[PDB]
């Protein structure tokens, strides 16, 4: 029992971070196989940063004008190429430590792992939900571009997201490993802000469960309600639409339980309408939105790695 | 910036978990060097727990008898010895992936991160503090049992603490990897429960640092007090004392931010007093005490391992 925020093992991801620096810029790398992934404005100075043209800055660089580190040993560049937002630099050496990868760009409302990097180590992990706006919360300091996002499944690393930049509210935006910026973001010091943020209800819906399998139950109301009507009451209080989908995703933690999907919505509008009266769930004052269903599977079951 | 539960990079405690099996009951090990670490009730069956009689079960059994895996390969047990709540077993091979390592005692309002295991694989790292009433609030399931507990300091891993038990309330209690119980806990399946327990004052005063690192900068009053006069008001809300070395070691913090540690103790007092008016702290509602004065330095520095 008890129910934590729970970051996957970052070993796999820890023995592919590297420093990449160009002049005087350093910033974290992934160095998968013989290529190093790192953010592009690794080639920008300062000032280069307030309107930067890339294709030009990267045309006046050669292979050595990168310096490459795992831990001391530097890594040989061999070619470097742009695509989108992200730098390649081939190395001479294949990491040894490549675990089995995919890059996958995922969807709003999903989760991952972030390891925090400075100068091409490791800092801390803390899990992250892609927000509706394309936004994470996130812990990033200067020197942290390049840390990467994962998700574990048994030995297979999916890496989904490379840290780029901080908006006002101190939240946070990067890019696939394609380089293709979450969101309308671009890769420029401009005025740039996240649009409005709104709450991820399905994984609301997947928390309450995780505190009804926890014995906290004192949310469970009586009533059932229907789709339509749950989702006319979450749109005043900038709750997502919840999908057929959605209730469909939710049908493990439902069979679990023996509590249907819509009976949970009821349960919910209530605790919209009314708030929580000064009580807690599973310890905390508000409902929290960073848990999938998969991540509450997950941690209630011991899935392992 | 941003400010999150942060945990240590697991990757040298995961090159450390083993599963040890001791006829049908399964648990975790801690491979370091030549020795396998593991909780001594891993040579009970069901029965055996409700008050096992560890000398004379031990007494009973050989190297053979324990089956000790390190992914698919069996590790050959030579030695077996009882310390305290912890067995030992010697294996004929070295840990070649052993880091540099101590076994240290927390003391209460310490924090460590956990890497929760099943059958000797991880499932997930979150950070833990070490409460009052020497309880930790985890997420373990049957299974956990000989999950560590560690901390990293630049290469050396200093583990704290193996997970044995669950108590009452959905919280946690264990052992230092010498086999002695945090607080007065018997590893026997009988009655026991935590004592009250108490907020971790100088972590709260910590966490209000690093709000006010990050702009978040609505509690901060006009007002000083004397620490007699905050120790007061702490003993009504159930909050610990805060003694002249709480108040020395939350001098970087205070120094940074130029806001002395009594003055933020005035700013404490009044949210305990007077509440937080449906507002938040760095996104809570509740006032955080599970960050140490150094973990908001690493964390707002950037410090790597
Ligand atoms: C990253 O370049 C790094 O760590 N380099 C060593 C850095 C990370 C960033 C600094 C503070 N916390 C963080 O997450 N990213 C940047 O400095 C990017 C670079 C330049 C401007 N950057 C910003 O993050 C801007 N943000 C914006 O201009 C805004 F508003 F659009 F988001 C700030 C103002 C420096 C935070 C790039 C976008 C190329
Ligand atoms: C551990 O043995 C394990 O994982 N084995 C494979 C297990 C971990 C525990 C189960 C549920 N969540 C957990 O953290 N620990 C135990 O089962 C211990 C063993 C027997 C009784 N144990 C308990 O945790 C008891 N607790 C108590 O009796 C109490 F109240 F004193 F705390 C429960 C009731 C099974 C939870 C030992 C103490 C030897
Ligand atoms: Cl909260």
Redesign the interface.
Known sequence: ????????????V??CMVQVTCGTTTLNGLWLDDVVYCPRHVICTSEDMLNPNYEDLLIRKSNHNFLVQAGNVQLRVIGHSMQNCVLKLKVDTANPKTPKYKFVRIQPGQTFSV?????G??????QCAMRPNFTI?????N??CGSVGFNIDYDCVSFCYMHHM?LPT???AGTDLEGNFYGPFVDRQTAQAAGTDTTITVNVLAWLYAAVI??DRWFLNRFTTTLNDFNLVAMKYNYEPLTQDHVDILGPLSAQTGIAVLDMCASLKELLQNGMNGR?IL????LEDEFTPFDVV????????
Do not use: D, I, W
């Open positions: 029992s008890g129910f934590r925020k729970m970051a996957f093992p970052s070993g796999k820890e023995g390891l925090a990097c400075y100068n180590s490791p800092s801390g992990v803390y919360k996130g812990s990033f300091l020197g942290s901080e101190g939240v946070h926890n014995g807690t310890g905390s004052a508000l997950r941690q209630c079951s011991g899935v392992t790695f």
